[PDB]
Design a protein around this ligand. Structure first.
Ligand SMILES: N=C(N)NCCC[C@H](NC(=O)c1cccc(O)c1O)C(=O)N[C@@H](CO)C(=O)O
Ligand SMILES: N=C(N)NCCC[C@H](NC(=O)c1cccc(O)c1O)C(=O)N[C@@H](CO)C(=O)O
Ligand SMILES: N=C(N)NCCC[C@H](NC(=O)c1cccc(O)c1O)C(=O)N[C@@H](CO)C(=O)O
Ligand SMILES: N=C(N)NCCC[C@H](NC(=O)c1cccc(O)c1O)C(=O)N[C@@H](CO)C(=O)O
Ligand SMILES: N=C(N)NCCC[C@H](NC(=O)c1cccc(O)c1O)C(=O)N[C@@H](CO)C(=O)O
Ligand SMILES: N=C(N)NCCC[C@H](NC(=O)c1cccc(O)c1O)C(=O)N[C@@H](CO)C(=O)O
Ligand SMILES: N=C(N)NCCC[C@H](NC(=O)c1cccc(O)c1O)C(=O)N[C@@H](CO)C(=O)O
Ligand SMILES: N=C(N)NCCC[C@H](NC(=O)c1cccc(O)c1O)C(=O)N[C@@H](CO)C(=O)O
Ligand SMILES: [Fe+3]
Ligand SMILES: [Fe+3]
Lengths: 346, 347, 347, 346
């Protein structure tokens, strides 16, 4: 038996072959365990990975066209999941997130699955990445019978994060740069989405930054008004996005099918917005883009490294997130790394 | 009949208004120009900023209108302290909010609640972009409160009294303009120095033909510049804002309805005697002044634009008198008598 | 409604409170600022530290309120002496506890018992992290005791009176600051010398622009530094804390409501005449002072921050008088008259 | 009475009223001593200040038109100095530089002046700034009877340098960025002029940088070929210039009459040159401009600070060399600071 991220006891199945993904992008944690056979044990998933990660999807489709035939249990919201379609896939395990675009610990679907005799595991990369990322992988390892892959990934992760924390854990608060992260910048109805005590805030903390929204918000995600950002006038501005290159909607283009030219061109649009464009950080060129889906992925060590190099350029001159990304893919994944997951303003 | 507010949103003009909700208490100043001798007749409730952050002007209105104490306070001095429940049970027929300040903004939940309740919401602004927004705000308030005459009268008064300044300062070339720093609530904040960028009192500096040293240091209307940056820039003219009550020995400039010239100058001097500030060229040369803080969010801000022009070019505006303008303002529009000191020069 | 206490825990605000339990008796000081002329009206019971470790302030309240003797003592002066049974039979509707001190902490069994009994528990702090916690503690007590006005009034008073110090000391560079050692309950502990690290009275030294020699010797808010370490560091300024009653022949400094200047000066001198202490440069040079110990856990601690600044920079704070601040505090908030000596200088 | 920078003993004159400047830009050291009467005691000077510092000249001329009437003893080279014109000015002291566009310790003119009974003082801000800048000011103080001004300036300088060395003195060599400084970049016949163990090299050393030319060159100044720079591929590129805005000759525009936008546009031209534009430092945006005349001025504490903030951006985020310049001008000089003495690439 194991304790999941909701504190609940889960009896590990003897053999797993029918994994249900409550949130599609929980695939990222699964991908680190399944080696060259990524989709072999997925009976169905939330449609967020296919619809909100179109780039990473297309790359896996070109090498694995059977991905199109994995059933979508819903669209991009917990409320759109048919519990009936879920149960007819006869899962032998269901992986859910404490938060996100899929069911949480108190949903009806979780109770239905408990009545059906199906083990449910809660992980978390989104609410409390710092507390939860590694424990989540340890647990997924045990319940999916991929302890070796999991232990390998934890060692890789700890080592690559320790490269940052060995330095930033000793830096005193008054020497840290102030940071604002604008999630899905440009692309929300009301500006400005950001992270508080949690989510990408954990990355700012680890990378030795000072999140200006840490004390403005009670939860992991929330909203701060444009004028509050202008008034705080933080040292460093970071925008997250995952927009596909050939999408004329507002947002930052980043992901597997994005070139540096397009990442720079679209970040600039984001930085040219009224108000934003007068920020000291934007004028001084301390303005950056990070791929949004790192907000819910155990690949988040790539962002902690990208934030650290932006917060202390020379102290992390020698650190290369692209090499960490390449080591990750070659050691663990079944596709080749492409595209741009981070960008600096021209 | 609809109107476009200061947030760009369309608002349907109520047929009759008798229950005005003030998102920020000091938005009363705009309302006071419209309500003549019956200032508080139509106010169902307001933010507590006017009563708690404008104690002097409050006390003067209370002595003539004791019923002001019975207007409900929907919160203290911050948007986050407003109970949306208390707000809705006052059954307002209009809510007036500010684009910025100590009350809810355009994206607050309370604004959405009120829209669900069928209550028209109007955004005004005297604080973020006074130059763009002050007159349009009054025009709009005129239409939605059915006081078009009072509003048009006040716009004419305002335009004329500002034109007295801009007719001169609009033709002055940049290289003849004095550099200016305004230290908001000088001495009274934890961390020095609050100031205004391209907005707020910065708009007044611009209009009065001054050169705001913080214009390009800051992205927003308000922000913070460090003492050493001020010392380094060493601007021609120093201005401190305050609204401290006379009998308060804490640091801050005393200005307002119950402040005498002696208290305003004694307390400005304390502010100018602070380490660092006291080595400014502007302080040593006596180009140091005090302005009443609440002009940072009031359509009476024409008084500050004029005080600024007279400090920026003393001889060219020798003949201009802001005290005459305040008196014309009060007598024409208000229901109280002008008292106290709203600005001061160092001696 | 709900609020966050000083332990990070959410507390549901009772609709009406009439049975307040004080985990530490001297938490009364925070309550006294809210209860006006009816100080003891809502206290069902308290730890015996206020009655037994604050005999002077107790006696003054007893003479005006003899019913104070009938408030139940839930224990003596240590968390371990509190009977949880006596506590629960008082049927409290709220319990106020301190993150640290002579009463239960956040992990005690009594706190869990009360949670099982459906009784809200609120953690405040004036002792571990006064700088971070004093004002937030008062705001919180305001909300849960339905005295938001009194609390907000006291915060404004406090901020203003501290700002009188910090406006000056916040700009002073480290190399111009005096070194300071504070000896808590000097002369009265078994092993010399108790003091404060990064917390407790250390926060006051920091704010008053001093350099606490024990800041980096100690991990916690309280600890112990050896006499020889003090002698070796030989700090600029020596401060002794005490609260000993005048007619108490035990060792320590006499300070409090029933102490005269001469009893405070004479007893400080005994403390300064002790072997080792008496060779300190600060003692020989007369930069030696006494402060009332209980300021180590009281929102009246603004009086200590002000006494410290005036000892650290005598001429820069010549004009500041902590006695006026105490009198303004008492008259505005309390139900007794200020008496005695809360601070003393060596002759 | 005092030992100059050439090791020679100079007899302090009882009263000085006729100062001869071997190199015009030695005026900068004099200006720190003469308060509001900068030109009162100058009998004549080399034409380098008037002809190679046209901007700083024009600013002093607008307040002091009598500067145009100070005699020019030559143009911009030691060989163009008429010793006859020099001697008829009847100087009572001559200030010369160990190196530069004026006579050195072995020149004939120095011997002529010794025969004429005129005290000669050697200073140095150019060959060995680190060893010589402060001793030079101490000496000038004594011989010009401005000991107070000199001691005031030394304290100011030491304090403002200590702001840098407190941090960079504890950085180990292997964490330091490699740096190349291209003096009068774009403006020489043959690329690339630079500094070795001396001149602006001393500033790189102090600011915790690693001068790639330190061991390529024997002297304070020299030349390294473009290909050697490309091959070393240093972390940080710095170009010096002092070109006037309205001068369309090649080089970087910096000085009292230069705006930031003109300094950025002209630095960019310099960075767009063949070879230079493939440097990692240029592509990564670690490319900067510094005002050339800091290569021979006791105001050089401004460049040391500008270099440290470029070498360690976050560790010196709170340091402002512009506030330092302003404290310098207000405390010591008779004119108002204007223009751009340093620039970052867009
Ligand atoms: N399209 C929707 N209606 N909901 C989206 C899903 C869940 C929601 N998402 C976010 O808040 C969010 C914020 C910033 C950036 C993102 O990518 C986001 O997905 C959400 O998290 N809701 C909370 C509270 O209900 C939760 O599920 O815990
Ligand atoms: N809690 C909400 N209602 N909205 C916040 C999240 C929902 C929605 N998110 C996306 O469209 C999205 C796209 C790519 C990756 C993601 O994680 C996403 O969450 C959203 O942000 N909607 C905007 C309007 O488009 C909004 O509601 O502000
Ligand atoms: N007491 C508080 N914690 N907040 C007050 C809320 C408004 C805040 N005020 C200022 O920035 C300010 C600055 C100088 C002088 C003043 O009188 C001020 O009130 C504020 O303006 N917030 C901005 C952005 O947060 C806004 O609402 O647009
Ligand atoms: N946005 C903030 N966090 N601070 C700026 C304003 C908050 C507060 N304002 C006032 O007290 C105030 C008083 C009169 C008139 C106003 O318009 C006011 O805003 C403030 O300044 N607090 C101080 C704490 O003493 C501070 O922020 O340093
Ligand atoms: N009578 C006892 N045996 N213990 C008393 C408990 C409180 C204890 N007090 C001190 O350590 C102290 C030190 C110097 C001066 C004082 O007035 C003191 O009261 C205490 O603080 N305990 C801490 C650590 O154990 C706590 O409760 O967190
Ligand atoms: N936790 C401990 N063991 N000692 C430290 C404090 C215990 C005791 N404190 C007091 O008597 C006291 C008096 C007035 C006000 C206070 O806050 C007090 O704590 C104490 O000091 N004990 C001495 C023995 O006398 C000691 O332990 O050295
Ligand atoms: N105008 C000339 N033809 N010669 C000037 C003589 C000084 C010469 N200067 C430089 O080489 C120099 C190099 C880079 C950047 C500069 O600003 C320079 O002035 C020089 O230093 N010559 C040597 C050897 O005679 C010396 O003076 O020690
Ligand atoms: N020793 C040499 N022959 N040349 C190097 C310096 C001589 C000349 N110097 C300047 O133009 C100059 C301008 C401003 C400030 C200075 O210190 C200067 O030296 C020079 O650079 N000539 C170039 C021809 O463009 C060259 O020799 O490459
Ligand atoms: Fe999302
Ligand atoms: Fe305000």
């Amino acid at each position: 038996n194991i304790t999941d991220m909701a504190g609940r006891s889960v009896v590990i199945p003897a053999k797993v072959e029918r994994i249900l993904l409550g949130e599609g992008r929980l695939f990222y944690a699964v991908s680190l365990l399944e080696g060259q056979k990524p989709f072999d044990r997925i009976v169905g998933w939330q449609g967020d990975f296919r619809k909100l990660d179109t780039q990473t999807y297309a790359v896996y489709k070109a090498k694995f066209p059977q991905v199109d035939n994995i059933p979508l249990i819903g669209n991009t919201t917990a409320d759109s999941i048919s519990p009936e379609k879920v149960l007819t896939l006869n899962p032998d395990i269901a992986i859910f997130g404490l938060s996100g675009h899929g069911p949480g610990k108190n949903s009806e679907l979780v109770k239905q699955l408990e009545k059906a005799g199906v083990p449910v595991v809660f992980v978390d990369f989104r609410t409390s990445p710092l507390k939860n990322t590694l424990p989540s992988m340890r647990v997924l390892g045990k319940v999916l019978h991929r302890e070796q892959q999991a232990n390998d990934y934890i060692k890789f992760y700890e080592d690559n994060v320790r490269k940052v924390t060995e330095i930033t854990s000793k830096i005193p608060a008054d020497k840290k740069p102030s940071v604002f992260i604008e999630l899905r910048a440009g692309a929300m109805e009301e500006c400005c989405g950001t992270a508080g005590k949690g989510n990408m805030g954990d990355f700012i903390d680890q990378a030795g930054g000072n999140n200006m929204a840490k004390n403005l918000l009670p939860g992991a995600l929330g909203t701060v008004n444009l004028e509050k950002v202008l008034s705080t006038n933080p040292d460093i501005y970071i925008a997250s996005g995952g927009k596909a290159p050939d999408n004329n909607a507002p947002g930052v283009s980043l992901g597997a099918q994005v070139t540096k030219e397009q990442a720079q061109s679209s970040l600039q649009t984001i930085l040219d917005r009224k108000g934003i464009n007068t920020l000291s950080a934007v004028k001084n060129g301390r303005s950056y883009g990070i791929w949004h889906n790192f907000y819910n992925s155990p690949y988040n060590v790539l962002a902690i490294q990208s934030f650290a190099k932006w917060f202390y350029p020379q102290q992390f001159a020698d650190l290369d997130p692209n090499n960490t990304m390449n080591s990750l893919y070659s050691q663990f994944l079944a596709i080749e790394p492409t595209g741009t997951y981070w960008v600096d303003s021209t």
